Design an enzyme around this catalytic site. Sequence first.
Site, PDB file in Angstrom:
ATOM      1  N   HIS A   1      26.455 -11.790 -10.915  1.00  0.00           N
ATOM      2  CA  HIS A   1      26.793 -12.942 -10.072  1.00  0.00           C
ATOM      3  C   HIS A   1      25.632 -13.910  -9.917  1.00  0.00           C
ATOM      4  O   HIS A   1      25.813 -15.118 -10.061  1.00  0.00           O
ATOM      5  CB  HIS A   1      27.238 -12.532  -8.658  1.00  0.00           C
ATOM      6  CG  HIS A   1      28.495 -11.724  -8.615  1.00  0.00           C
ATOM      7  ND1 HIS A   1      28.667 -10.668  -7.740  1.00  0.00           N
ATOM      8  CD2 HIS A   1      29.637 -11.810  -9.337  1.00  0.00           C
ATOM      9  CE1 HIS A   1      29.865 -10.141  -7.929  1.00  0.00           C
ATOM     10  NE2 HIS A   1      30.472 -10.813  -8.894  1.00  0.00           N
TER      11      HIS A   1
ATOM     12  N   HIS B   1       0.781  -1.243   0.000  1.00  0.00           N
ATOM     13  CA  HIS B   1       0.000   0.000   0.000  1.00  0.00           C
ATOM     14  C   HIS B   1       0.820   1.305   0.000  1.00  0.00           C
ATOM     15  O   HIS B   1       0.571   2.173  -0.850  1.00  0.00           O
ATOM     16  CB  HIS B   1      -1.116  -0.002   1.069  1.00  0.00           C
ATOM     17  CG  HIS B   1      -0.729  -0.640   2.371  1.00  0.00           C
ATOM     18  ND1 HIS B   1      -0.272  -1.939   2.465  1.00  0.00           N
ATOM     19  CD2 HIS B   1      -0.755  -0.159   3.640  1.00  0.00           C
ATOM     20  CE1 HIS B   1      -0.015  -2.223   3.732  1.00  0.00           C
ATOM     21  NE2 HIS B   1      -0.302  -1.162   4.465  1.00  0.00           N
TER      22      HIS B   1
ATOM     23  N   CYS C   1       8.363  -2.124  -1.319  1.00  0.00           N
ATOM     24  CA  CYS C   1       7.660  -1.846  -0.073  1.00  0.00           C
ATOM     25  C   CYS C   1       8.529  -0.850   0.677  1.00  0.00           C
ATOM     26  O   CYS C   1       9.439  -0.276   0.077  1.00  0.00           O
ATOM     27  CB  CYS C   1       7.324  -3.116   0.738  1.00  0.00           C
ATOM     28  SG  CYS C   1       8.691  -4.153   1.367  1.00  0.00           S
ATOM     29  N   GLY C   2       8.252  -0.619   1.960  1.00  0.00           N
ATOM     30  CA  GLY C   2       9.006   0.377   2.728  1.00  0.00           C
ATOM     31  C   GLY C   2      10.518   0.225   2.649  1.00  0.00           C
ATOM     32  O   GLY C   2      11.240   1.154   2.251  1.00  0.00           O
TER      33      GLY C   2
ATOM     34  N   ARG D   1      10.652   3.656   1.108  1.00  0.00           N
ATOM     35  CA  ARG D   1      10.880   4.547   2.261  1.00  0.00           C
ATOM     36  C   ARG D   1      12.365   4.730   2.621  1.00  0.00           C
ATOM     37  O   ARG D   1      12.701   5.597   3.443  1.00  0.00           O
ATOM     38  CB  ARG D   1      10.105   4.056   3.506  1.00  0.00           C
ATOM     39  CG  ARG D   1       8.588   4.176   3.417  1.00  0.00           C
ATOM     40  CD  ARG D   1       8.129   5.620   3.218  1.00  0.00           C
ATOM     41  NE  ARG D   1       6.673   5.702   3.130  1.00  0.00           N
ATOM     42  CZ  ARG D   1       5.868   6.096   4.119  1.00  0.00           C
ATOM     43  NH1 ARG D   1       6.367   6.479   5.298  1.00  0.00           N
ATOM     44  NH2 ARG D   1       4.550   6.115   3.920  1.00  0.00           N
TER      45      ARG D   1
ATOM     46  N   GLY E   1      10.825  -7.459   3.470  1.00  0.00           N
ATOM     47  CA  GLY E   1       9.771  -8.478   3.447  1.00  0.00           C
ATOM     48  C   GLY E   1       9.517  -9.015   2.042  1.00  0.00           C
ATOM     49  O   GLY E   1       9.316 -10.217   1.860  1.00  0.00           O
TER      50      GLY E   1
ATOM     51  N   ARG F   1      27.139 -22.163  -8.435  1.00  0.00           N
ATOM     52  CA  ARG F   1      26.573 -21.702  -7.169  1.00  0.00           C
ATOM     53  C   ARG F   1      25.060 -21.525  -7.267  1.00  0.00           C
ATOM     54  O   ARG F   1      24.342 -21.846  -6.327  1.00  0.00           O
ATOM     55  CB  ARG F   1      27.292 -20.439  -6.670  1.00  0.00           C
ATOM     56  CG  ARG F   1      28.799 -20.630  -6.697  1.00  0.00           C
ATOM     57  CD  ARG F   1      29.545 -19.792  -5.734  1.00  0.00           C
ATOM     58  NE  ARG F   1      30.142 -18.626  -6.360  1.00  0.00           N
ATOM     59  CZ  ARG F   1      31.446 -18.376  -6.437  1.00  0.00           C
ATOM     60  NH1 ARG F   1      32.341 -19.225  -5.947  1.00  0.00           N
ATOM     61  NH2 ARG F   1      31.851 -17.257  -7.015  1.00  0.00           N
TER      62      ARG F   1
END
Lengths: 151, 150, 151, 150
Positions: free
Chosen positions: D100, D9, D67-68, D111, D72, D139
Amino acid sequence: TRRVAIGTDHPAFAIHENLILYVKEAGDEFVPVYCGPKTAESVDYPDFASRVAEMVARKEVEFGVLACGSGIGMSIAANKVPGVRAALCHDHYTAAMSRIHNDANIVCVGERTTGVEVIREIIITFLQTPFSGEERHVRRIEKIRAIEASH
Amino acid sequence: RRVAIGTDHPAFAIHENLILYVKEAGDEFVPVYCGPKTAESVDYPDFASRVAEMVARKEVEFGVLACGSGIGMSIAANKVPGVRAALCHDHYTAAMSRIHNDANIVCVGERTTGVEVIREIIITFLQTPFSGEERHVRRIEKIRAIEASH
Amino acid sequence: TRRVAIGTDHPAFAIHENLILYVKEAGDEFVPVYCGPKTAESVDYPDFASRVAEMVARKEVEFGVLACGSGIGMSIAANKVPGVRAALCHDHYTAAMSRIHNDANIVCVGERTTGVEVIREIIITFLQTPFSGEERHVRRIEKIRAIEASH
Amino acid sequence: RRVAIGTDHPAFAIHENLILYVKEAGDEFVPVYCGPKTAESVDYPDFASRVAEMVARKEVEFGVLACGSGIGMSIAANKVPGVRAALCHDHYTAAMSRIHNDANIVCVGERTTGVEVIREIIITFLQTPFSGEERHVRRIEKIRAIEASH
């Protein structure tokens, strides 16, 4: 060719070889002129900022590179010399913009804040990025010169 | 503890943010807004100069300056004798500018650094005291001697 | 006390002593458990990410610290282990928020991107900052667990 | 070259920015917006999951998540097998995540990181190719083996 004076304080001396290398990596036309401490001994960053800044202001070199822990003291001290526009940079974007907007002639970096590979990118970006030449930027840079003259 | 705030036109968008962040640092911190009153185009050195002169004169203890990258702000402000302007991009730089350099002006990039990190930078800058350490005092005095020599 | 497993790849091994120290600096209650390479030899970051991540997921330790050049590979690899919430942090703010919002249990850092004094601050901030416990965060973390279960 | 975009949001504020930055990377880059349609409250893992599944399924080549802090987003996206999600905070991290790690999703903090640096991050992420180097391939395959073992 284009001469680039380099200075550090004592702890940033650990990477003075790095800085010389990165100047060279920007292109064969860039010549590093090392003016930092020759040894790991204790020094005061203003003395080395002044030294590189004076070289830039007297036009003995085109650009300066200054490193200390945060880069903050180097940017304050170097800017005290008339004719110097010293930019504390922390990434590619600030390195490029300091040239495009401010026609910066000294780049300052923090050896304890910014990883060496990002310092490398900052130095290359700063040296390779041309000043835009645009009307508003020229006016603003002249205003900075005006401030110098008034003191 | 008075704090003068200046921005250019783009950074004018967050001028109310900066006023608020100064207050958040503590009741004793008083923002004095000196930036543009509108979103119309201005030149960063003018507002840098206004804030910087206030700090130099001892009219306010601190300054806050914002533009796209913060870079022009830090260059212009440092041209004023007595100003030690620090371009900060995080908590660490904000704190160290006070601890090592006794910085009196904080510069931020509104286009480079997110508002929440700007909030952290301003609060940290205002709350963090100068260490008073011998070496820092000496080096700060050396900066003053560079001003005097020019 | 609170156990903190530490892993690096080969180049970040240069600072494994630093990392041990910074864990201790967060407080006497934090115990560093070094699980990185014993030598400067070539290794693959996923093997060390896995090792630390498994220890966290099996609850042998409370927290993990992972370092490589950028920190990016460590964060990808570590998150592949169910129960792990690994946060690539580059400053104090991200370090604090990873705990407040995400209740992160592993902090990842880039040794070639972030200066050591900022890495120090990241590690201390991450260990000392508590999870908020707030309703929305708990719901979101449970949704991440839901994603794990669906695969 | 399709690029799925998701936000929560707060980051919805710059969703039009992200669409534009994807297009700026080149004519071949096609943004597919999958984030919230309004500014109302949502949970980041839902939108992370939507974008991540699209990348994993091979419906789009790349994802962009904001997001901020971006944190997350990178945690939730990486829970999907086949996703390699990189939280980037500058040009260097954006480039290296591709070189890489052959990253297929870029995560940013709205943010924490200024919009102009976000622009640079997204353009660099999309334009920078994977190196194809032997060690990186190995890898990346080891990451796939960690997924398989769980």
